[PDB]
């Protein structure tokens, strides 16, 4: 029921195909909230499992995204950076590299 989270928490986004969904967290300073990034046409998004937390970019408005280097085993994070210099943590991938090839498919174009 994937779709459903996402129908509900951007009604905004209606017109948008689903093109990928991806379990992980946003992280942000202390803060950990487990959730689902969303891959649509010209939006990344994310959307707290449990909270009410969630976020929502246009390709338009992202400057780089980068594979974060880790040595440690269950860190596995991507990074993206905005055109405002805001940055944005998602950590805990189950499948970081398909997730990351699915965001450079969208955001490259």
């Not at 009604?11 to 959730?35: I, R």
């Not at 998004?45 to 969630?54: E, I």
Request: hydrophobic share 45%; aromatic share 14%.
């Amino acid at each position: 029921n994937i779709e459903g989270v996402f129908r509900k928490s951007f009604p905004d986004l209606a017109g948008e195909t689903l093109l990928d969904s991806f379990n992980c967290a946003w992280v942000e300073g202390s803060a950990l909230k487990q959730g689902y990034l969303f891959i649509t046409p010209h939006w990344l998004c994310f959307q707290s499992t449990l909270a009410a937390a969630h976020f929502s970019i246009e390709y338009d408005e992202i400057k780089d995204i980068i594979k974060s280097k880790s040595v440690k085993m269950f860190e596995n994070a991507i990074e993206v950076k905005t055109h405002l210099n805001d940055t944005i943590f998602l950590t805990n991938f189950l499948q970081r590299d398909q997730a990351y090839s699915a965001l450079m498919s969208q955001w490259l174009k």
